[PDB]
Design a protein around this ligand. Structure first.
Ligand SMILES: CCCCCCCCCCCC(=O)O
Ligand SMILES: CCCCCCCCCCCC(=O)O
Lengths: 158, 158
Protein backbone atom coordinates (compact mmCIF):
# COMPACT_ATOMS: atom_id res chain seq x y z
CA UNK A 1 0.00 0.00 0.00
CA UNK A 2 1.49 3.35 -1.16
CA UNK A 3 -1.27 5.13 -3.09
CA UNK A 4 -4.07 6.45 -0.91
CA UNK A 5 -5.73 8.78 -3.35
CA UNK A 6 -8.72 7.00 -4.76
CA UNK A 7 -11.94 8.12 -6.34
CA UNK A 8 -15.12 8.18 -4.24
CA UNK A 9 -18.29 7.16 -6.09
CA UNK A 10 -16.59 5.90 -9.23
CA UNK A 11 -19.03 4.84 -11.89
CA UNK A 12 -16.90 2.42 -13.93
CA UNK A 13 -19.31 2.26 -16.89
CA UNK A 14 -18.80 6.00 -17.40
CA UNK A 15 -15.03 5.57 -18.16
CA UNK A 16 -15.76 3.60 -21.31
CA UNK A 17 -14.21 4.66 -24.61
CA UNK A 18 -11.22 6.52 -26.00
CA UNK A 19 -8.33 7.90 -23.92
CA UNK A 20 -4.94 9.49 -24.50
CA UNK A 21 -1.99 8.92 -22.15
CA UNK A 22 -1.03 12.56 -21.92
CA UNK A 23 1.56 12.06 -19.12
CA UNK A 24 3.13 9.11 -17.24
CA UNK A 25 5.28 8.82 -14.08
CA UNK A 26 7.00 6.05 -12.18
CA UNK A 27 8.84 5.40 -8.95
CA UNK A 28 11.85 4.08 -10.84
CA UNK A 29 13.46 5.54 -13.98
CA UNK A 30 13.94 2.07 -15.53
CA UNK A 31 10.17 1.51 -15.52
CA UNK A 32 9.74 4.13 -18.32
CA UNK A 33 13.15 5.32 -19.61
CA UNK A 34 13.35 3.30 -22.89
CA UNK A 35 10.64 2.96 -25.56
CA UNK A 36 10.56 -0.76 -24.63
CA UNK A 37 10.42 -0.24 -20.82
CA UNK A 38 8.11 -2.86 -19.36
CA UNK A 39 5.52 -0.27 -18.13
CA UNK A 40 5.66 2.36 -20.88
CA UNK A 41 2.11 1.74 -22.18
CA UNK A 42 -0.16 4.01 -24.18
CA UNK A 43 -3.85 3.61 -23.46
CA UNK A 44 -6.21 3.45 -26.46
CA UNK A 45 -9.56 2.50 -25.06
CA UNK A 46 -11.31 1.43 -21.86
CA UNK A 47 -14.09 -1.15 -21.97
CA UNK A 48 -15.83 -2.00 -18.71
CA UNK A 49 -17.64 -5.37 -18.90
CA UNK A 50 -21.29 -5.95 -17.74
CA UNK A 51 -20.09 -7.80 -14.58
CA UNK A 52 -18.00 -4.66 -13.78
CA UNK A 53 -14.50 -5.75 -14.87
CA UNK A 54 -12.39 -3.38 -17.00
CA UNK A 55 -10.87 -4.42 -20.31
CA UNK A 56 -8.06 -2.21 -21.48
CA UNK A 57 -6.76 -1.68 -24.98
CA UNK A 58 -3.34 -0.16 -25.35
CA UNK A 59 -0.15 0.05 -27.39
CA UNK A 60 3.28 -1.05 -26.14
CA UNK A 61 6.63 -1.04 -27.99
CA UNK A 62 8.02 -4.56 -27.74
CA UNK A 63 10.15 -6.30 -30.41
CA UNK A 64 11.22 -3.17 -32.34
CA UNK A 65 7.53 -2.50 -33.19
CA UNK A 66 4.45 -0.85 -31.73
CA UNK A 67 2.22 -3.71 -30.58
CA UNK A 68 -1.47 -3.71 -29.60
CA UNK A 69 -2.33 -5.48 -26.36
CA UNK A 70 -5.55 -6.41 -24.56
CA UNK A 71 -5.56 -6.58 -20.78
CA UNK A 72 -8.46 -7.47 -18.47
CA UNK A 73 -8.54 -5.80 -15.07
CA UNK A 74 -10.73 -7.66 -12.60
CA UNK A 75 -12.98 -5.88 -10.11
CA UNK A 76 -12.52 -5.98 -6.34
CA UNK A 77 -14.83 -5.03 -3.40
CA UNK A 78 -13.59 -1.47 -3.86
CA UNK A 79 -15.05 0.26 -6.93
CA UNK A 80 -11.82 2.23 -7.63
CA UNK A 81 -9.39 -0.69 -7.44
CA UNK A 82 -8.83 -3.52 -9.89
CA UNK A 83 -6.50 -6.51 -10.17
CA UNK A 84 -4.43 -7.44 -13.20
CA UNK A 85 -3.27 -11.06 -13.43
CA UNK A 86 0.53 -11.30 -13.67
CA UNK A 87 3.24 -13.23 -11.74
CA UNK A 88 3.04 -10.80 -8.82
CA UNK A 89 -0.30 -9.41 -7.66
CA UNK A 90 -0.69 -6.11 -9.56
CA UNK A 91 -3.24 -3.50 -8.51
CA UNK A 92 -4.77 -0.64 -10.52
CA UNK A 93 -6.40 2.34 -8.73
CA UNK A 94 -8.50 5.09 -10.23
CA UNK A 95 -7.50 8.19 -8.24
CA UNK A 96 -9.80 10.74 -9.82
CA UNK A 97 -11.84 11.30 -13.03
CA UNK A 98 -14.50 13.71 -14.29
CA UNK A 99 -15.40 11.10 -16.97
CA UNK A 100 -15.54 13.60 -19.83
CA UNK A 101 -12.08 15.30 -19.76
CA UNK A 102 -9.51 13.38 -17.64
CA UNK A 103 -8.76 10.26 -15.59
CA UNK A 104 -5.81 9.64 -13.22
CA UNK A 105 -4.78 6.13 -12.39
CA UNK A 106 -1.80 4.33 -10.88
CA UNK A 107 -0.71 0.73 -11.04
CA UNK A 108 1.33 -0.78 -8.21
CA UNK A 109 2.88 -4.12 -7.27
CA UNK A 110 1.83 -5.65 -3.96
CA UNK A 111 6.85 -0.89 -3.70
CA UNK A 112 6.97 0.04 -7.42
CA UNK A 113 4.46 2.34 -9.08
CA UNK A 114 3.40 3.87 -12.45
CA UNK A 115 0.73 6.53 -12.85
CA UNK A 116 -0.81 8.29 -15.87
CA UNK A 117 -2.91 11.28 -16.66
CA UNK A 118 -5.44 10.14 -19.29
CA UNK A 119 -7.33 12.67 -21.37
CA UNK A 120 -10.26 12.33 -23.84
CA UNK A 121 -8.71 14.36 -26.67
CA UNK A 122 -5.23 14.93 -28.28
CA UNK A 123 -4.80 18.17 -26.34
CA UNK A 124 -2.57 19.50 -23.57
CA UNK A 125 -4.93 20.00 -20.65
CA UNK A 126 -2.95 22.10 -18.13
CA UNK A 127 -5.70 21.59 -15.60
CA UNK A 128 -5.60 17.78 -15.72
CA UNK A 129 -1.75 17.86 -15.55
CA UNK A 130 -2.07 20.03 -12.44
CA UNK A 131 -4.33 17.44 -10.77
CA UNK A 132 -1.79 14.83 -11.91
CA UNK A 133 1.17 16.70 -10.36
CA UNK A 134 -0.84 17.33 -7.18
CA UNK A 135 -1.60 13.60 -6.79
CA UNK A 136 2.04 12.67 -7.48
CA UNK A 137 3.42 15.14 -4.91
CA UNK A 138 2.30 12.52 -2.36
CA UNK A 139 4.26 9.76 -4.13
CA UNK A 140 7.93 8.88 -4.65
CA UNK A 141 8.30 9.34 -8.45
CA UNK A 142 11.67 9.59 -10.21
CA UNK A 143 10.67 9.88 -13.85
CA UNK A 144 7.88 11.88 -15.47
CA UNK A 145 7.04 11.99 -19.18
CA UNK A 146 4.57 14.11 -21.11
CA UNK A 147 3.52 14.07 -24.77
CA UNK A 148 2.51 16.77 -27.23
CA UNK A 149 -0.62 16.70 -29.52
CA UNK A 150 1.39 15.43 -32.52
CA UNK A 151 2.81 12.45 -30.61
CA UNK A 152 -0.63 11.72 -29.12
CA UNK A 153 -1.92 10.99 -32.67
CA UNK A 154 0.90 8.55 -33.44
CA UNK A 155 1.20 4.87 -32.64
CA UNK A 156 3.30 4.46 -29.49
CA UNK A 157 3.53 8.29 -29.34
CA UNK A 158 6.27 8.36 -31.99
CA UNK B 1 15.82 32.80 -26.36
CA UNK B 2 13.46 30.71 -24.15
CA UNK B 3 14.92 30.84 -20.63
CA UNK B 4 14.53 34.19 -18.92
CA UNK B 5 15.27 33.19 -15.38
CA UNK B 6 18.84 34.12 -14.66
CA UNK B 7 20.79 34.87 -11.53
CA UNK B 8 21.44 38.49 -10.56
CA UNK B 9 24.86 39.15 -9.01
CA UNK B 10 26.35 35.76 -9.75
CA UNK B 11 29.80 35.33 -8.33
CA UNK B 12 31.20 32.59 -10.59
CA UNK B 13 34.24 31.85 -8.38
CA UNK B 14 31.84 30.86 -5.58
CA UNK B 15 30.38 27.91 -7.63
CA UNK B 16 33.71 26.09 -7.64
CA UNK B 17 33.90 22.50 -6.45
CA UNK B 18 31.77 19.39 -6.10
CA UNK B 19 28.16 19.06 -7.31
CA UNK B 20 25.53 16.35 -7.66
CA UNK B 21 22.99 16.33 -10.51
CA UNK B 22 20.01 15.62 -8.29
CA UNK B 23 17.39 16.17 -11.04
CA UNK B 24 17.37 16.86 -14.82
CA UNK B 25 14.67 17.94 -17.31
CA UNK B 26 14.45 18.54 -21.03
CA UNK B 27 12.13 19.90 -23.66
CA UNK B 28 12.25 16.64 -25.58
CA UNK B 29 12.07 13.09 -24.19
CA UNK B 30 14.81 11.85 -26.55
CA UNK B 31 17.30 14.29 -25.00
CA UNK B 32 17.36 12.22 -21.75
CA UNK B 33 15.36 8.97 -22.17
CA UNK B 34 18.26 6.47 -22.66
CA UNK B 35 21.41 6.16 -20.54
CA UNK B 36 23.33 7.20 -23.69
CA UNK B 37 21.06 10.19 -24.58
CA UNK B 38 23.26 12.98 -25.91
CA UNK B 39 22.43 15.36 -22.99
CA UNK B 40 22.14 12.96 -20.05
CA UNK B 41 25.23 14.25 -18.19
CA UNK B 42 26.13 13.98 -14.52
CA UNK B 43 28.10 16.90 -13.14
CA UNK B 44 31.12 16.09 -10.95
CA UNK B 45 32.88 19.37 -10.41
CA UNK B 46 32.85 23.02 -11.46
CA UNK B 47 36.12 24.90 -11.94
CA UNK B 48 35.93 28.57 -12.84
CA UNK B 49 39.18 29.82 -14.41
CA UNK B 50 41.00 33.07 -13.35
CA UNK B 51 39.83 34.89 -16.54
CA UNK B 52 36.23 33.94 -15.51
CA UNK B 53 35.52 30.97 -17.81
CA UNK B 54 33.95 27.81 -16.34
CA UNK B 55 35.49 24.38 -16.75
CA UNK B 56 33.12 21.52 -16.11
CA UNK B 57 33.90 17.97 -15.13
CA UNK B 58 31.19 15.40 -15.64
CA UNK B 59 30.33 11.80 -16.43
CA UNK B 60 28.43 10.67 -19.54
CA UNK B 61 27.49 7.13 -20.63
CA UNK B 62 28.80 6.70 -24.17
CA UNK B 63 30.12 3.43 -25.68
CA UNK B 64 28.54 1.03 -23.13
CA UNK B 65 30.66 2.65 -20.37
CA UNK B 66 30.58 5.61 -17.99
CA UNK B 67 33.05 8.12 -19.44
CA UNK B 68 34.62 11.21 -17.84
CA UNK B 69 34.52 14.39 -19.90
CA UNK B 70 35.98 17.88 -19.57
CA UNK B 71 34.10 20.82 -21.05
CA UNK B 72 35.09 24.50 -21.03
CA UNK B 73 32.28 27.04 -20.92
CA UNK B 74 33.39 30.48 -22.08
CA UNK B 75 32.23 33.68 -20.42
CA UNK B 76 30.04 36.30 -22.08
CA UNK B 77 29.20 39.96 -21.18
CA UNK B 78 26.49 38.55 -18.94
CA UNK B 79 27.84 36.98 -15.73
CA UNK B 80 25.13 34.24 -15.67
CA UNK B 81 25.50 33.07 -19.27
CA UNK B 82 28.27 31.05 -20.86
CA UNK B 83 28.99 29.58 -24.30
CA UNK B 84 30.01 26.01 -25.02
CA UNK B 85 31.76 25.37 -28.34
CA UNK B 86 29.89 22.79 -30.45
CA UNK B 87 28.56 22.71 -34.05
CA UNK B 88 25.59 24.90 -33.12
CA UNK B 89 25.99 27.80 -30.71
CA UNK B 90 25.12 26.34 -27.28
CA UNK B 91 24.37 28.57 -24.30
CA UNK B 92 24.48 27.77 -20.56
CA UNK B 93 22.56 29.95 -18.05
CA UNK B 94 22.81 29.92 -14.28
CA UNK B 95 19.23 30.59 -13.14
CA UNK B 96 19.75 30.64 -9.40
CA UNK B 97 22.25 29.41 -6.74
CA UNK B 98 22.89 29.94 -3.02
CA UNK B 99 26.47 28.64 -3.60
CA UNK B 100 26.48 26.34 -0.58
CA UNK B 101 23.40 24.08 -1.12
CA UNK B 102 22.04 24.22 -4.72
CA UNK B 103 22.51 25.57 -8.25
CA UNK B 104 19.98 25.57 -11.13
CA UNK B 105 21.19 25.82 -14.67
CA UNK B 106 19.85 25.23 -18.18
CA UNK B 107 21.58 24.70 -21.46
CA UNK B 108 19.90 25.70 -24.71
CA UNK B 109 20.64 25.69 -28.45
CA UNK B 110 20.45 29.03 -30.26
CA UNK B 111 14.46 25.68 -29.34
CA UNK B 112 15.76 22.66 -27.34
CA UNK B 113 16.60 22.81 -23.66
CA UNK B 114 18.01 20.77 -20.72
CA UNK B 115 18.05 21.95 -17.10
CA UNK B 116 19.41 20.47 -13.86
CA UNK B 117 19.12 20.96 -10.17
CA UNK B 118 22.66 20.62 -8.76
CA UNK B 119 23.22 20.03 -5.08
CA UNK B 120 26.41 20.01 -2.91
CA UNK B 121 25.73 16.69 -1.15
CA UNK B 122 24.24 13.20 -1.97
CA UNK B 123 20.94 14.18 -0.40
CA UNK B 124 17.36 14.80 -1.54
CA UNK B 125 16.85 18.50 -0.96
CA UNK B 126 13.07 19.03 -1.29
CA UNK B 127 13.61 22.76 -1.13
CA UNK B 128 16.03 22.90 -4.08
CA UNK B 129 13.71 20.58 -6.11
CA UNK B 130 10.87 23.02 -5.39
CA UNK B 131 12.92 25.93 -6.79
CA UNK B 132 13.73 23.64 -9.73
CA UNK B 133 10.05 22.82 -10.40
CA UNK B 134 9.11 26.50 -9.99
CA UNK B 135 11.69 27.56 -12.60
CA UNK B 136 10.59 24.79 -15.00
CA UNK B 137 6.89 25.71 -14.74
CA UNK B 138 7.84 28.58 -17.08
CA UNK B 139 9.41 26.19 -19.60
CA UNK B 140 8.16 23.53 -22.03
CA UNK B 141 9.67 20.34 -20.52
CA UNK B 142 8.53 16.82 -21.47
CA UNK B 143 10.83 14.63 -19.42
CA UNK B 144 12.00 15.00 -15.82
CA UNK B 145 14.37 12.66 -13.97
CA UNK B 146 15.44 12.59 -10.34
CA UNK B 147 17.99 10.43 -8.51
CA UNK B 148 18.15 8.97 -5.01
CA UNK B 149 21.17 9.20 -2.59
CA UNK B 150 22.42 5.70 -3.55
CA UNK B 151 22.50 6.51 -7.29
CA UNK B 152 24.12 9.89 -6.57
CA UNK B 153 27.19 8.03 -5.17
CA UNK B 154 27.54 5.83 -8.27
CA UNK B 155 29.28 6.53 -11.55
CA UNK B 156 26.69 7.66 -14.10
CA UNK B 157 24.05 7.35 -11.32
CA UNK B 158 23.86 3.56 -11.78
C1 LIG C 1 -8.52 3.37 -15.20
C2 LIG C 1 -7.92 2.06 -15.64
C3 LIG C 1 -6.63 2.28 -16.40
C4 LIG C 1 -6.04 0.91 -16.64
C5 LIG C 1 -4.78 0.98 -17.49
C6 LIG C 1 -3.73 0.10 -16.84
C7 LIG C 1 -2.86 -0.60 -17.87
C8 LIG C 1 -2.15 -1.75 -17.17
C9 LIG C 1 -0.88 -2.15 -17.90
C10 LIG C 1 -0.60 -3.63 -17.69
C11 LIG C 1 0.89 -3.93 -17.54
C12 LIG C 1 1.51 -4.09 -18.92
O1 LIG C 1 0.99 -4.87 -19.76
O2 LIG C 1 2.54 -3.42 -19.16
C1 LIG D 1 26.53 26.23 -13.82
C2 LIG D 1 27.25 25.62 -14.99
C3 LIG D 1 26.79 24.19 -15.23
C4 LIG D 1 27.45 23.74 -16.51
C5 LIG D 1 27.14 22.29 -16.82
C6 LIG D 1 26.76 22.19 -18.28
C7 LIG D 1 27.25 20.90 -18.91
C8 LIG D 1 27.20 21.08 -20.42
C9 LIG D 1 27.12 19.74 -21.14
C10 LIG D 1 27.79 19.83 -22.51
C11 LIG D 1 27.06 19.02 -23.57
C12 LIG D 1 27.54 17.59 -23.52
O1 LIG D 1 28.77 17.33 -23.55
O2 LIG D 1 26.66 16.69 -23.47
Amino acid sequence: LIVTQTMKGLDIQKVAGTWYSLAMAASDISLLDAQSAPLRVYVEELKPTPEGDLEILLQKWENDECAQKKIIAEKTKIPAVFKIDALNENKVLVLDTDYKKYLLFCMENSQSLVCQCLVRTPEVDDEALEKFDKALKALPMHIRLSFNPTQLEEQCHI
